[PDB]
Amino acid sequence: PKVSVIMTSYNKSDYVAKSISSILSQTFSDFELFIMDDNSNEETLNVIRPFLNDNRVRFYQSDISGVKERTEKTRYAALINQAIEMAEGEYITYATDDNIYMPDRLLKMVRELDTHPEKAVIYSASKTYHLNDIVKETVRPAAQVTWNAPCAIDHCSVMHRYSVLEKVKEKFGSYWDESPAFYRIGDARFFWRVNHFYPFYPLDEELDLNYITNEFVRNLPPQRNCRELRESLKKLGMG
């Protein structure tokens, strides 16, 4: 397939079907969908079950269990890295179990990369709907080419060439960073690595949406943050 879509899943039984269905109904159909479930509860697994009948879906479930294992690494990064190693697509893209793809997301993003060989990473605008019906509507625009993506661009808003992964792994030893010090902002850290080599090209359309209204947290290491990443890129001076 042209595109590999990598989705991570963990215990969002009330949202995951909408997410998966939004991917499977894309107008561009030439993709494989990795559903990397991190050993979710019964309810979640049962909502995911019927989707496994679509031949484009590649389902993998970890054996992760307990607070030690859940905090040993940034789980979704470990899962993404695993998917990346099995991927066949020329273009890579990400999804989560509570994010919805708009129907023409893949078509448009594929077309942008097919049409501009000079662009290696692209990003779209993203929208969030607040519920309480709708009360608030937020949009994260994509108006400029950026060498400083961390914390300005989300997980589910990007698509890139497989070749980018090559570069990143050559310099850093892995694709995404599994260190649990980057648990809250794993996508930002991956973007930080990419931004050592590639800028992010905008596609000014809203192509993904989010709907919104402890022993785990207490067992992570101290969490590094955005400023730290952004400041480090600002240095460097790639743009």
Ligand X SMILES: Cc1cn([C@H]2C[C@H](O)[C@@H](COP(=O)(O)OP(=O)(O)O)O2)c(=O)[nH]c1=O
Smallest separation, CB 166 to Mg ion (Å) = 26
154 catalytic residue (yes or no): no
Bridge partners, 229 (sequence order): none
Q: How many residues bind ligand X (CB under 6 A)?
A: 11
- Alpha-carbon torsion, ordered 152, 29, 40, 193, to 10 deg: -30
**Distance between CA atoms of residues 63 and 47, nearest Å:** 19
H or E element, residue 204? strand 201-212
**Distance between CA atoms of residues 199 and 46, nearest Å:** 40
Q: Which of 38, 97, 154, 187 is catalytic?
A: 187
The item of Mg ion, ligand X, none sharing an interface with residue 127, based on CB under 5 to 8 Å by kind, is none
The item of Mg ion, ligand X, none sharing an interface with residue 97, based on CB under 5 to 8 Å by kind, is ligand X
What sign for the dihedral angle of Cα 204, 149, 22, 116? positive
Q: Is 32 one of the binding residues for ligand X (CB under 6 A)? A: no
Q: Is 44 one of the binding residues for ligand X (CB under 6 A)? A: no
Quick one: tokens of 44?
A: 């979640």
H or E element, residue 131? strand 121-131
Judged by DSSP in three states, 24 sits in helix
Smallest separation, CB 62 to ligand X (Å) = 8
Q: Is 96 one of the binding residues for ligand X (CB under 6 A)? A: yes
Candidate residues 75, 105, 161, 230; the one interacting with ligand X per rule CB under 6 A: 75
The item of ligand X, Mg ion, none sharing an interface with residue 10, based on CB under 5 to 8 Å by kind, is ligand X
45 CB-near residues (< 8 Å, 6+ apart): 37, 61
Span near Mg ion by CB under 5 A; candidates 17-25, 91-99, 169-177, 213-221: 91-99
Quick one: tokens of 165?
A: 């992964």
Distance of CA 44 to the CA centre of its chain: 20
Nearer to ligand X, 212 or 238 (CB): 212
Q: Is 190 one of the binding residues for ligand X (CB under 6 A)? A: no
236: left (phi over 0), alpha (psi -120 to 50) or beta: left
The item of ligand X, Mg ion, none sharing an interface with residue 74, based on CB under 5 to 8 Å by kind, is none
Smallest separation, CB 179 to Mg ion (Å) = 17
217 CB-near residues (< 8 Å, 6+ apart): none
The item of ligand X, Mg ion, none sharing an interface with residue 71, based on CB under 5 to 8 Å by kind, is none
Candidate residues 3, 4, 8, 157; the one interacting with ligand X per rule CB under 6 A: 8
Binders of ligand X in range 101-140 (CB under 6 A): none
Give the residues lining the site for Mg ion (CB under 5 A). 98
Give the residues lining the site for ligand X (CB under 6 A). 8-10, 38, 70, 75-76, 79, 96-98
